[PDB]
Write a protein that binds this ligand. Structure first.
Ligand SMILES: CC(C)(COP(=O)(O)OP(=O)(O)OC[C@H]1O[C@@H](n2cnc3c(N)ncnc32)[C@H](O)[C@@H]1OP(=O)(O)O)[C@@H](O)C(=O)NCCC(=O)NCCS
Ligand SMILES: *C(=O)CCCCCCCCCCCCC
Lengths: 8, 391
């Protein structure tokens, strides 16, 4: 799977 | 387990039984963990009572719609359950039917009574170069178990069954990615995010105002030109297939984990398809194509919000430079994404991306994408040596 990231 | 030494606490009951290096072990050799099997289990693994295997014919629009719905409602979410991937049905055809795709490798799980789709895993063939070896492998993607069927060991049976179906075709290695730490990553890459519509991103809590900044300041800071600057930029066309293949192949040689694409595979992965994959080539004053950029379309659902339902994200794919500076190329990638209506442009810190991430105002993300090899023991590598992007 790809993974969902967002700005930390 | 999303970080390395909290993965050190864990025991891995499933992965300890699989041909992968142990999380802690130092690897100095290169090769398979177990021999190629000359006798393979002929019968599918048993599923719990009331469920059945079903190979999905994605050429059937209703079954493809069933797969879209399964993933749309149950696939990957962020670390706070605010967004979920929304792979479109025609994107799924793109990712799941490249040259050499096989129908038995589109492996779904159905409820016997209702016929409802509740599980899925996929394999596609890929020739992979890893250090000094080229091996035919498969890429494993879209492992999904319905929320009402979780924590019942359906994911391990899915992995074993696709393994079995790949073994039957004479392939004994695979590559895959995941946002969690498992035994054992061959490389770790970090996602970075370049705001394109910072007000939407801030409204839906995708982004947050940086320290002592205001929404008005932020909108100015992230503004971009309205047209690209690179001379001769245009969308990729059929006549560009050979040079794009030539450009990609030679550029990838500097990294240690890369795809080895045929020209037919280059056509599939890069020929532009609206709302799926965009590829732009630089054709100079000589009529020569010298660079190209590409990014794919992967929106996400926004959960629990009354007005904003979807976030349109672009993902950096493969970017080859031989005469245009990579900073300039990616700058135009941001402009083209903005024009096409994306809210954010994402990229990993692999290949040479670290040379433009900070300078183009990318903000580092909270998500790591780990890269894994199945039945191949080799030393790990820094992200700058990973040259492979999946969907
Ligand atoms: C990921 C998912 C399939 C796990 O399903 P599950 O059947 O409820 O998980 P189970 O409790 O039955 O067992 C999980 C086993 O499969 C492994 N596993 C979990 N996620 C995995 C992934 N993306 N890739 C490969 N293996 C995975 C686990 O490591 C575990 O093995 P372990 O004993 O060594 O830890 C399911 O939760 C899901 O669909 N999540 C959303 C989509 C997704 O894939 N998110 C990323 C998860 S990393
Ligand atoms: C994202 O969905 C990736 C999920 C990967 C699951 C583990 C796959 C392990 C390799 C299985 C195929 C082996 C073929 C020899």
């Amino acid at each position: 799977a790809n993974c969902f990231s967002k700005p930390r | 387990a999303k970080t390395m030494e909290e993965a050190s606490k864990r025991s891995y009951q499933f992965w300890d039984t699989q041909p992968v290096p142990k999380l802690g072990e130092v690897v100095n050799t290169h090769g398979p963990v177990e021999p190629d099997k000359d006798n393979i289990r002929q019968e599918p693994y048993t599923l719990p009572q009331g469920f059945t295997w079903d190979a999905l014919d994605l050429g059937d629009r209703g079954v493809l719609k069933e797969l879209y719905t399964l993933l749309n409602e149950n696939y990957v979410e962020d670390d706070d359950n605010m967004f979920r991937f929304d792979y479109s049905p025609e994107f799924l055809l793109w990712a799941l039917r490249p040259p050499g795709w096989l129908p038995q490798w589109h492996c779904g799980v159905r409820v016997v009574s209702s016929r409802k789709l509740v599980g899925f895993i996929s394999a596609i063939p890929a020739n992979i170069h890893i250090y000094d070896t080229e091996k035919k492998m498969v890429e494993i993607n879209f492992l999904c178990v319905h929320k009402k069927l979780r924590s019942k060991r359906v994911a391990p049976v899915l992995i074993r069954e696709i393994t079995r179906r790949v073994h039957l075709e004479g392939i004994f290695q695979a590559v895959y990615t995941a946002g969690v730490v498992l035994p054992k990553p061959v490389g770790t890459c970090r996602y970075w995010h370049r705001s394109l519509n910072p007000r939407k991103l801030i409204e839906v809590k995708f982004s947050h105002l940086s320290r002592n900044m205001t929404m008005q300041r932020t909108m100015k800071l992230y503004r971009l030109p309205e047209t690209p600057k690179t001379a001769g930029l245009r969308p990729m066309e059929t006549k560009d297939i050979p040079v794009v293949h030539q450009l990609l192949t030679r550029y990838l040689k500097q990294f240690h984990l890369t795809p080895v694409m045929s020209q037919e595979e280059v056509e599939h992965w890069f020929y532009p398809q609206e709302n799926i994959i965009d590829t732009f080539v630089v054709e100079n004053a000589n009529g020569e194509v010298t660079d190209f950029l590409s990014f794919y379309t992967l929106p996400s659902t926004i959960m629990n919000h009354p007005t904003h339902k979807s976030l349109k994200a672009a993902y950096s794919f493969y970017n080859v430079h031989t005469q245009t500076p990579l900073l300039d190329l990616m700058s135009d990638a941001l402009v083209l994404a903005k024009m096409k209506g994306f809210d954010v442009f994402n990229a990993l810190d692999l290949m040479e991306n670290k040379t433009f991430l900070e300078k183009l105002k990318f903000g580092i993300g909270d998500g790591n994408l780990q890269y894994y090899l199945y039945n191949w023991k080799c030393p790990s590598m820094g992200a700058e040596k990973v040259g492979l992007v999946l969907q």
